[PDB]
Amino acid sequence: AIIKEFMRFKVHMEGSVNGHEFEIEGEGEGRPYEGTQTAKLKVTKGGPLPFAWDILSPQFSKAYVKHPADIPDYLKLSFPEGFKWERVMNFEDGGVVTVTQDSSLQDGEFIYKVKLRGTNFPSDGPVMQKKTMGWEASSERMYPEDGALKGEIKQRLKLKDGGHYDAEVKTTYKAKKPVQLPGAYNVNIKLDITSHNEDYTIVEQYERAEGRHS
Amino acid sequence: QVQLVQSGGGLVAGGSLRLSCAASGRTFSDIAVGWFRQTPGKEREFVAAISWSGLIINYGDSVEDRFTISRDNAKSAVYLQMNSLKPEDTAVYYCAARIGMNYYYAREIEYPYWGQGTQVTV
C-alpha cells in the first residue's frame, strides 16, 4: 500500500519565540493504523532554548491516528501527495503560537516541514521560565468546514508548582488532493516526553491517538 | 498561475475604505494574500497578510487595531478594511499572493504574484 503498518518520518522546523530564533531536526517512527509513534528531536540552531519545550512538542503527525472503520481517514487518503495544516494556540496569559506545516511522502517515509512563531509570552510566565511539565490528555473535536478538516482543542499544560496552564487551539487540515472528508468526531491524544538531556537540546517524545464517534 | 485584480480604491480623515483583491487559477484555499504600500516611495512597507486557512493574520505596525484583513473562499477575494484612516496613510496599496503560507510576510520577493495598484488619498 501507500501507508504501511510501520512508517518512518523526518521533520524539519524553523521557528522563533519572543524573538529567539531556532531550528530543530528530528526523526521518528510509528504504527499509523495503531495510532502510536515516537520521535527524537535535536536543536540544531539557537540552542539551548530560553522557553519551555512543551509549546513545541505538539508540532512534531496525524497520519498516525487509529480510526474506526466507518470514519474516513482523511489524512491517510491524502497520500502519496500529502496535506498541510495551520495551527494557532491562544494561551490563557496572552501568548500566541502560530504554526504552518507541510506533509509529504518521499521514498516510503513521511517528510514534515514546520514553521513556528511564538509571541507575547510574559517574561515571568511559565513558558519563558520552563515551569511546565507536560501536556494532559486532550480531546480534539474534528469537523469538516469549507471543504477542509478542522479541529478545536481545549489543551491544558501541567505546571511544576502543581497548577495548570490552558490554551485554546484551532487547526485546519487540508489535503493537497481532493479526498473524502469525514463527519464530526473526536480524537483522543496523549503526548509524553520520554527522555531529554539537561538543557532540552535532545528530546524524545511518544504519542497515542485514537479516533471515535457515536 | 494566480492572477490578481485590485478594487475598492478611492479617496477619504478617519474614514473607511474597503480594499479588495480577486484571484483566479489556483484554488483560493491554497493561496496566501499580502498587502504592501508606498506613498511617494519611502520604502514599500508591510500592511497586512492572511494565511490559506484564515487563522494566521500577521499585521504590520501602524495598521494595528486600525486596519483588519479578512478572506472569503466563496467569493475568492480578500478584503482590507481600513478604519480610522490617518493622513499619513495616503499611499498606493498593492495586493500580493503567496502559495504555501509565508513564515516571513514582509518579504515582497517571497510573494511571487503581484497585482496592479490602487491609490488611497486621505
mmCIF file of C-alpha atoms in Angstrom:
data_model
loop_
_atom_site.group_PDB
_atom_site.id
_atom_site.type_symbol
_atom_site.label_atom_id
_atom_site.label_comp_id
_atom_site.label_asym_id
_atom_site.label_seq_id
_atom_site.Cartn_x
_atom_site.Cartn_y
_atom_site.Cartn_z
ATOM 1 C CA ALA A 1 0.000 0.000 0.000
ATOM 2 C CA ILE A 2 0.971 3.654 0.396
ATOM 3 C CA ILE A 3 0.786 3.859 4.206
ATOM 4 C CA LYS A 4 2.369 0.678 5.541
ATOM 5 C CA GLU A 5 1.648 -0.591 9.045
ATOM 6 C CA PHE A 6 5.097 0.729 10.040
ATOM 7 C CA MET A 7 6.171 4.087 8.609
ATOM 8 C CA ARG A 8 9.105 6.335 9.478
ATOM 9 C CA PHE A 9 9.233 10.107 9.153
ATOM 10 C CA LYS A 10 11.650 13.037 9.228
ATOM 11 C CA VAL A 11 10.770 16.529 10.451
ATOM 12 C CA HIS A 12 12.331 19.952 9.821
ATOM 13 C CA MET A 13 11.459 23.031 11.880
ATOM 14 C CA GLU A 14 12.338 26.725 11.738
ATOM 15 C CA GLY A 15 10.773 28.914 14.402
ATOM 16 C CA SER A 16 11.020 31.913 16.695
ATOM 17 C CA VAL A 17 9.563 32.513 20.164
ATOM 18 C CA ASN A 18 9.658 36.030 21.654
ATOM 19 C CA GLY A 19 12.461 36.983 19.256
ATOM 20 C CA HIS A 20 14.743 33.990 19.872
ATOM 21 C CA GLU A 21 15.084 32.106 16.581
ATOM 22 C CA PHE A 22 15.911 28.408 16.384
ATOM 23 C CA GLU A 23 15.921 25.331 14.158
ATOM 24 C CA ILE A 24 15.111 21.716 15.035
ATOM 25 C CA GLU A 25 15.755 18.471 13.153
ATOM 26 C CA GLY A 26 14.268 15.126 14.107
ATOM 27 C CA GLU A 27 13.491 11.574 13.069
ATOM 28 C CA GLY A 28 10.671 9.295 14.133
ATOM 29 C CA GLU A 29 8.637 6.167 13.507
ATOM 30 C CA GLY A 30 5.365 4.552 14.472
ATOM 31 C CA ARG A 31 2.387 2.427 13.501
ATOM 32 C CA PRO A 32 -0.102 4.641 11.608
ATOM 33 C CA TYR A 33 -3.108 2.311 11.852
ATOM 34 C CA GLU A 34 -2.426 1.631 15.549
ATOM 35 C CA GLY A 35 -2.139 5.312 16.483
ATOM 36 C CA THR A 36 1.297 5.219 18.141
ATOM 37 C CA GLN A 37 4.533 6.982 17.235
ATOM 38 C CA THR A 38 7.824 8.182 18.706
ATOM 39 C CA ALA A 39 10.406 10.759 17.664
ATOM 40 C CA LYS A 40 13.816 12.140 18.628
ATOM 41 C CA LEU A 41 14.263 15.895 18.189
ATOM 42 C CA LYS A 42 17.545 17.813 18.214
ATOM 43 C CA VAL A 43 18.002 21.584 18.438
ATOM 44 C CA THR A 44 20.446 22.301 15.608
ATOM 45 C CA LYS A 45 20.376 26.114 15.808
ATOM 46 C CA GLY A 46 19.722 28.594 18.598
ATOM 47 C CA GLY A 47 20.147 26.065 21.403
ATOM 48 C CA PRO A 48 19.630 25.961 24.299
ATOM 49 C CA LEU A 49 16.093 27.360 24.068
ATOM 50 C CA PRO A 50 15.087 30.066 26.585
ATOM 51 C CA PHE A 51 11.499 28.749 26.759
ATOM 52 C CA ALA A 52 9.591 25.599 27.647
ATOM 53 C CA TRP A 53 9.801 22.661 25.248
ATOM 54 C CA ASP A 54 6.111 21.879 25.818
ATOM 55 C CA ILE A 55 4.913 24.530 23.347
ATOM 56 C CA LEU A 56 6.911 22.832 20.563
ATOM 57 C CA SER A 57 6.035 19.179 21.211
ATOM 58 C CA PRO A 58 2.508 19.202 19.638
ATOM 59 C CA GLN A 59 4.048 20.388 16.339
ATOM 60 C CA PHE A 60 6.231 17.336 15.614
ATOM 61 C CA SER A 61 1.706 13.976 12.687
ATOM 62 C CA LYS A 62 -1.929 12.930 12.442
ATOM 63 C CA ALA A 63 -1.197 10.277 9.828
ATOM 64 C CA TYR A 64 -0.670 8.106 12.935
ATOM 65 C CA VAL A 65 -4.245 8.170 14.253
ATOM 66 C CA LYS A 66 -6.210 4.968 14.811
ATOM 67 C CA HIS A 67 -9.550 5.476 13.074
ATOM 68 C CA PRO A 68 -12.702 3.345 13.234
ATOM 69 C CA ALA A 69 -13.630 1.547 10.033
ATOM 70 C CA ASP A 70 -16.665 3.797 9.452
ATOM 71 C CA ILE A 71 -14.732 7.086 9.801
ATOM 72 C CA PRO A 72 -12.810 8.076 6.633
ATOM 73 C CA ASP A 73 -9.126 8.579 7.432
ATOM 74 C CA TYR A 74 -8.887 11.923 5.659
ATOM 75 C CA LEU A 75 -5.165 12.494 6.232
ATOM 76 C CA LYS A 76 -4.172 8.943 5.276
ATOM 77 C CA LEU A 77 -6.016 9.072 1.939
ATOM 78 C CA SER A 78 -4.295 12.391 1.142
ATOM 79 C CA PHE A 79 -1.080 10.464 0.421
ATOM 80 C CA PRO A 80 1.118 9.862 -1.582
ATOM 81 C CA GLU A 81 0.643 13.622 -2.133
ATOM 82 C CA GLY A 82 0.174 14.669 1.493
ATOM 83 C CA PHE A 83 -1.513 17.557 3.254
ATOM 84 C CA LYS A 84 -0.911 20.872 5.003
ATOM 85 C CA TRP A 85 -2.168 22.258 8.295
ATOM 86 C CA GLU A 86 -2.126 25.554 10.190
ATOM 87 C CA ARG A 87 -2.387 25.963 13.952
ATOM 88 C CA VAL A 88 -2.981 28.878 16.325
ATOM 89 C CA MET A 89 -2.704 28.278 20.076
ATOM 90 C CA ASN A 90 -4.061 31.125 22.215
ATOM 91 C CA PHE A 91 -2.708 30.713 25.738
ATOM 92 C CA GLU A 92 -4.525 31.998 28.811
ATOM 93 C CA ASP A 93 -1.910 34.683 29.575
ATOM 94 C CA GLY A 94 -1.862 36.244 26.091
ATOM 95 C CA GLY A 95 0.825 34.084 24.495
ATOM 96 C CA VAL A 96 0.102 33.086 20.899
ATOM 97 C CA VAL A 97 1.798 30.296 18.930
ATOM 98 C CA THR A 98 1.464 30.215 15.133
ATOM 99 C CA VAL A 99 2.284 27.084 13.124
ATOM 100 C CA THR A 100 2.264 26.060 9.466
ATOM 101 C CA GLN A 101 3.235 22.592 8.298
ATOM 102 C CA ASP A 102 3.653 20.609 5.081
ATOM 103 C CA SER A 103 3.393 16.812 4.965
ATOM 104 C CA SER A 104 4.621 14.761 2.004
ATOM 105 C CA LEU A 105 5.804 11.241 1.162
ATOM 106 C CA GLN A 106 9.283 10.618 -0.262
ATOM 107 C CA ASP A 107 10.768 7.128 -0.705
ATOM 108 C CA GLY A 108 8.391 5.466 1.751
ATOM 109 C CA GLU A 109 8.911 7.985 4.573
ATOM 110 C CA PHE A 110 6.819 10.963 5.630
ATOM 111 C CA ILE A 111 8.523 14.357 5.342
ATOM 112 C CA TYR A 112 7.427 17.111 7.731
ATOM 113 C CA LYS A 113 8.365 20.785 7.367
ATOM 114 C CA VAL A 114 7.246 23.125 10.146
ATOM 115 C CA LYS A 115 7.383 26.893 10.652
ATOM 116 C CA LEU A 116 6.521 28.344 14.059
ATOM 117 C CA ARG A 117 6.102 31.803 15.594
ATOM 118 C CA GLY A 118 5.510 32.358 19.311
ATOM 119 C CA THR A 119 4.759 35.851 20.557
ATOM 120 C CA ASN A 120 3.549 37.772 23.627
ATOM 121 C CA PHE A 121 4.591 35.281 26.298
ATOM 122 C CA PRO A 122 5.086 37.172 29.590
ATOM 123 C CA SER A 123 8.696 37.274 30.745
ATOM 124 C CA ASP A 124 7.695 35.835 34.141
ATOM 125 C CA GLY A 125 5.261 33.346 32.603
ATOM 126 C CA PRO A 126 5.536 29.574 32.823
ATOM 127 C CA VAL A 127 6.723 29.352 29.204
ATOM 128 C CA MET A 128 9.720 31.704 29.235
ATOM 129 C CA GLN A 129 10.785 30.142 32.555
ATOM 130 C CA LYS A 130 10.168 26.432 31.789
ATOM 131 C CA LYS A 131 7.790 25.973 34.719
ATOM 132 C CA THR A 132 5.745 23.440 32.711
ATOM 133 C CA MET A 133 5.860 19.650 32.871
ATOM 134 C CA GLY A 134 3.961 18.004 30.032
ATOM 135 C CA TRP A 135 0.516 18.103 28.446
ATOM 136 C CA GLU A 136 -2.564 16.424 29.848
ATOM 137 C CA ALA A 137 -4.652 14.071 27.726
ATOM 138 C CA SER A 138 -6.579 16.078 25.135
ATOM 139 C CA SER A 139 -9.747 15.517 23.112
ATOM 140 C CA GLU A 140 -9.760 17.225 19.707
ATOM 141 C CA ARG A 141 -13.176 17.840 18.131
ATOM 142 C CA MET A 142 -12.895 17.233 14.384
ATOM 143 C CA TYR A 143 -15.444 18.636 11.942
ATOM 144 C CA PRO A 144 -15.453 19.379 8.197
ATOM 145 C CA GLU A 145 -15.748 23.025 7.186
ATOM 146 C CA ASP A 146 -15.139 24.937 3.938
ATOM 147 C CA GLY A 147 -14.000 21.776 2.168
ATOM 148 C CA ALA A 148 -11.303 21.139 4.793
ATOM 149 C CA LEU A 149 -10.919 19.278 8.092
ATOM 150 C CA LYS A 150 -10.813 21.451 11.213
ATOM 151 C CA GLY A 151 -10.197 20.719 14.875
ATOM 152 C CA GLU A 152 -10.627 22.560 18.161
ATOM 153 C CA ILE A 153 -8.818 21.582 21.371
ATOM 154 C CA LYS A 154 -9.072 22.791 24.970
ATOM 155 C CA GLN A 155 -5.469 21.970 25.815
ATOM 156 C CA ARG A 156 -4.045 22.036 29.343
ATOM 157 C CA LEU A 157 -0.405 22.220 30.442
ATOM 158 C CA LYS A 158 0.798 20.928 33.798
ATOM 159 C CA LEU A 159 2.843 23.272 35.983
ATOM 160 C CA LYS A 160 5.771 22.284 38.186
ATOM 161 C CA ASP A 161 4.135 24.011 41.172
ATOM 162 C CA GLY A 162 1.019 21.813 40.853
ATOM 163 C CA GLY A 163 -1.167 24.219 38.882
ATOM 164 C CA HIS A 164 -2.277 24.154 35.266
ATOM 165 C CA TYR A 165 -1.930 26.440 32.255
ATOM 166 C CA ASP A 166 -4.529 26.365 29.485
ATOM 167 C CA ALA A 167 -4.581 27.205 25.780
ATOM 168 C CA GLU A 168 -7.238 27.306 23.055
ATOM 169 C CA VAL A 169 -6.031 25.592 19.871
ATOM 170 C CA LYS A 170 -7.633 25.623 16.414
ATOM 171 C CA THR A 171 -6.201 23.740 13.433
ATOM 172 C CA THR A 172 -7.247 23.429 9.781
ATOM 173 C CA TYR A 173 -6.202 20.326 7.831
ATOM 174 C CA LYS A 174 -6.386 20.440 4.028
ATOM 175 C CA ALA A 175 -5.342 17.633 1.697
ATOM 176 C CA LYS A 176 -3.275 18.598 -1.337
ATOM 177 C CA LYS A 177 -5.644 16.455 -3.434
ATOM 178 C CA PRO A 178 -9.442 16.227 -3.009
ATOM 179 C CA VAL A 179 -10.260 13.178 -0.888
ATOM 180 C CA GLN A 180 -13.255 12.138 1.184
ATOM 181 C CA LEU A 181 -13.902 14.323 4.230
ATOM 182 C CA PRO A 182 -15.187 12.563 7.367
ATOM 183 C CA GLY A 183 -18.002 13.565 9.689
ATOM 184 C CA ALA A 184 -17.789 15.179 13.099
ATOM 185 C CA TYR A 185 -15.807 13.031 15.531
ATOM 186 C CA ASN A 186 -13.306 13.188 18.383
ATOM 187 C CA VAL A 187 -9.605 12.326 18.588
ATOM 188 C CA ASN A 188 -8.112 11.357 21.957
ATOM 189 C CA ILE A 189 -4.423 12.291 22.157
ATOM 190 C CA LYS A 190 -1.770 11.772 24.837
ATOM 191 C CA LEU A 191 1.706 13.209 24.215
ATOM 192 C CA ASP A 192 4.577 12.271 26.531
ATOM 193 C CA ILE A 193 8.187 13.416 26.821
ATOM 194 C CA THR A 194 10.015 10.129 27.345
ATOM 195 C CA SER A 195 13.577 11.454 27.682
ATOM 196 C CA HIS A 196 15.638 14.622 27.415
ATOM 197 C CA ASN A 197 19.130 15.897 28.147
ATOM 198 C CA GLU A 198 19.862 18.648 30.674
ATOM 199 C CA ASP A 199 19.021 21.678 28.502
ATOM 200 C CA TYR A 200 16.365 20.041 26.264
ATOM 201 C CA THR A 201 18.565 20.086 23.165
ATOM 202 C CA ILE A 202 17.871 16.360 22.615
ATOM 203 C CA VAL A 203 14.276 15.333 23.363
ATOM 204 C CA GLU A 204 12.300 12.149 22.695
ATOM 205 C CA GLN A 205 8.504 12.009 22.519
ATOM 206 C CA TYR A 206 5.684 9.474 22.325
ATOM 207 C CA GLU A 207 2.095 9.999 21.197
ATOM 208 C CA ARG A 208 -1.021 7.818 21.289
ATOM 209 C CA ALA A 209 -4.031 8.900 19.224
ATOM 210 C CA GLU A 210 -7.342 7.137 18.613
ATOM 211 C CA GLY A 211 -10.485 8.391 16.906
ATOM 212 C CA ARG A 212 -14.034 7.553 17.938
ATOM 213 C CA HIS A 213 -17.614 8.694 17.414
ATOM 214 C CA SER A 214 -21.183 7.644 18.166
ATOM 215 C CA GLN B 1 -0.824 30.945 -12.273
ATOM 216 C CA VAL B 2 -2.562 33.060 -9.636
ATOM 217 C CA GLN B 3 -3.832 36.332 -11.107
ATOM 218 C CA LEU B 4 -4.839 39.374 -9.063
ATOM 219 C CA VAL B 5 -7.035 42.414 -9.741
ATOM 220 C CA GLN B 6 -7.461 45.046 -7.025
ATOM 221 C CA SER B 7 -10.578 47.118 -6.373
ATOM 222 C CA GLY B 8 -12.062 49.432 -3.764
ATOM 223 C CA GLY B 9 -9.538 52.240 -4.163
ATOM 224 C CA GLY B 10 -10.656 55.823 -3.718
ATOM 225 C CA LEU B 11 -10.383 58.976 -1.608
ATOM 226 C CA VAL B 12 -11.309 59.662 2.008
ATOM 227 C CA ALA B 13 -9.691 61.697 7.582
ATOM 228 C CA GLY B 14 -10.612 58.881 9.956
ATOM 229 C CA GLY B 15 -12.869 57.179 7.425
ATOM 230 C CA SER B 16 -13.456 53.767 5.882
ATOM 231 C CA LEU B 17 -12.131 52.254 2.649
ATOM 232 C CA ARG B 18 -12.666 48.557 1.904
ATOM 233 C CA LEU B 19 -9.877 47.487 -0.443
ATOM 234 C CA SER B 20 -10.284 44.207 -2.312
ATOM 235 C CA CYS B 21 -8.328 41.778 -4.486
ATOM 236 C CA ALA B 22 -9.693 38.864 -6.529
ATOM 237 C CA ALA B 23 -7.862 35.704 -7.572
ATOM 238 C CA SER B 24 -8.102 33.102 -10.331
ATOM 239 C CA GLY B 25 -6.209 29.972 -11.297
ATOM 240 C CA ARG B 26 -5.120 28.112 -8.176
ATOM 241 C CA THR B 27 -7.798 27.441 -5.572
ATOM 242 C CA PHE B 28 -8.094 30.291 -3.064
ATOM 243 C CA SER B 29 -7.854 27.757 -0.223
ATOM 244 C CA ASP B 30 -4.162 27.300 -1.141
ATOM 245 C CA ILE B 31 -3.252 30.981 -1.701
ATOM 246 C CA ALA B 32 -1.903 33.355 0.952
ATOM 247 C CA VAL B 33 -2.572 37.048 0.309
ATOM 248 C CA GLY B 34 -0.482 40.061 1.270
ATOM 249 C CA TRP B 35 -0.687 43.843 1.217
ATOM 250 C CA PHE B 36 2.042 46.463 0.787
ATOM 251 C CA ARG B 37 2.054 50.228 0.351
ATOM 252 C CA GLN B 38 4.325 53.053 -0.795
ATOM 253 C CA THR B 39 3.420 56.691 -0.543
ATOM 254 C CA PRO B 40 5.843 58.588 -2.891
ATOM 255 C CA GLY B 41 8.311 55.835 -2.439
ATOM 256 C CA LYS B 42 9.681 55.946 1.124
ATOM 257 C CA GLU B 43 10.022 52.148 1.194
ATOM 258 C CA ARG B 44 7.262 49.651 0.397
ATOM 259 C CA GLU B 45 6.201 48.711 3.938
ATOM 260 C CA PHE B 46 4.180 45.734 5.140
ATOM 261 C CA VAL B 47 0.463 46.330 5.705
ATOM 262 C CA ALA B 48 -1.260 43.013 6.415
ATOM 263 C CA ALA B 49 -1.434 39.393 5.289
ATOM 264 C CA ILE B 50 -3.593 36.298 5.744
ATOM 265 C CA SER B 51 -2.810 32.589 5.580
ATOM 266 C CA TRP B 52 -4.544 29.919 3.491
ATOM 267 C CA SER B 53 -6.717 28.849 6.445
ATOM 268 C CA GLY B 54 -7.519 32.346 7.739
ATOM 269 C CA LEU B 55 -6.072 31.518 11.166
ATOM 270 C CA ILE B 56 -2.826 33.487 10.714
ATOM 271 C CA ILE B 57 -3.331 37.239 10.337
ATOM 272 C CA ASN B 58 0.088 38.891 10.544
ATOM 273 C CA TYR B 59 -0.446 42.652 10.679
ATOM 274 C CA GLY B 60 2.125 45.430 10.374
ATOM 275 C CA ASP B 61 2.788 48.465 12.560
ATOM 276 C CA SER B 62 0.527 51.489 12.076
ATOM 277 C CA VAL B 63 -2.276 49.167 10.928
ATOM 278 C CA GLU B 64 -2.554 47.745 14.455
ATOM 279 C CA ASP B 65 -6.214 47.851 15.555
ATOM 280 C CA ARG B 66 -6.942 50.425 12.834
ATOM 281 C CA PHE B 67 -6.906 48.052 9.851
ATOM 282 C CA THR B 68 -8.138 44.476 9.540
ATOM 283 C CA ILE B 69 -7.888 41.790 6.858
ATOM 284 C CA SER B 70 -10.335 39.014 6.015
ATOM 285 C CA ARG B 71 -10.786 36.440 3.265
ATOM 286 C CA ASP B 72 -13.741 34.631 1.699
ATOM 287 C CA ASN B 73 -13.144 31.331 -0.092
ATOM 288 C CA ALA B 74 -16.630 31.541 -1.638
ATOM 289 C CA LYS B 75 -16.090 34.826 -3.500
ATOM 290 C CA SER B 76 -12.340 34.091 -3.865
ATOM 291 C CA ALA B 77 -11.318 37.560 -2.699
ATOM 292 C CA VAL B 78 -9.531 39.235 0.201
ATOM 293 C CA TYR B 79 -10.671 42.412 1.944
ATOM 294 C CA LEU B 80 -8.616 45.011 3.836
ATOM 295 C CA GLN B 81 -10.995 47.149 5.899
ATOM 296 C CA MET B 82 -9.074 50.359 6.621
ATOM 297 C CA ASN B 83 -10.650 52.269 9.511
ATOM 298 C CA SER B 84 -9.527 55.456 11.265
ATOM 299 C CA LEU B 85 -7.585 56.460 8.163
ATOM 300 C CA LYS B 86 -4.887 58.992 9.090
ATOM 301 C CA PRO B 87 -3.470 61.486 6.564
ATOM 302 C CA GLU B 88 -0.108 59.685 6.732
ATOM 303 C CA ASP B 89 -1.735 56.561 5.237
ATOM 304 C CA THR B 90 -2.116 58.321 1.867
ATOM 305 C CA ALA B 91 -0.348 55.863 -0.432
ATOM 306 C CA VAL B 92 -0.779 53.380 -3.267
ATOM 307 C CA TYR B 93 -1.573 49.932 -1.871
ATOM 308 C CA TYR B 94 -0.620 46.653 -3.543
ATOM 309 C CA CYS B 95 -2.032 43.140 -3.170
ATOM 310 C CA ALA B 96 0.398 40.219 -3.434
ATOM 311 C CA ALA B 97 -0.151 36.469 -3.227
ATOM 312 C CA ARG B 98 1.895 33.508 -1.997
ATOM 313 C CA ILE B 99 1.212 29.765 -2.087
ATOM 314 C CA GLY B 100 2.199 27.690 0.945
ATOM 315 C CA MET B 101 1.865 30.476 3.525
ATOM 316 C CA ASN B 102 4.587 32.931 4.498
ATOM 317 C CA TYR B 103 6.650 32.459 7.639
ATOM 318 C CA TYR B 104 8.130 35.799 6.661
ATOM 319 C CA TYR B 105 5.375 38.057 5.269
ATOM 320 C CA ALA B 106 7.341 41.325 4.864
ATOM 321 C CA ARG B 107 9.475 39.862 2.062
ATOM 322 C CA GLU B 108 7.978 41.089 -1.209
ATOM 323 C CA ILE B 109 10.139 38.782 -3.335
ATOM 324 C CA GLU B 110 8.742 35.780 -1.455
ATOM 325 C CA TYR B 111 5.325 36.806 -2.811
ATOM 326 C CA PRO B 112 5.725 35.834 -6.486
ATOM 327 C CA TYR B 113 2.334 37.018 -7.770
ATOM 328 C CA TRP B 114 1.792 40.780 -7.596
ATOM 329 C CA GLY B 115 -1.182 42.854 -8.692
ATOM 330 C CA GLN B 116 -1.972 46.250 -10.203
ATOM 331 C CA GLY B 117 -2.285 49.212 -7.836
ATOM 332 C CA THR B 118 -4.931 51.245 -6.008
ATOM 333 C CA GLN B 119 -4.269 54.752 -4.688
ATOM 334 C CA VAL B 120 -5.654 55.895 -1.326
ATOM 335 C CA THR B 121 -5.757 59.671 -0.781
ATOM 336 C CA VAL B 122 -6.926 60.627 2.712
#
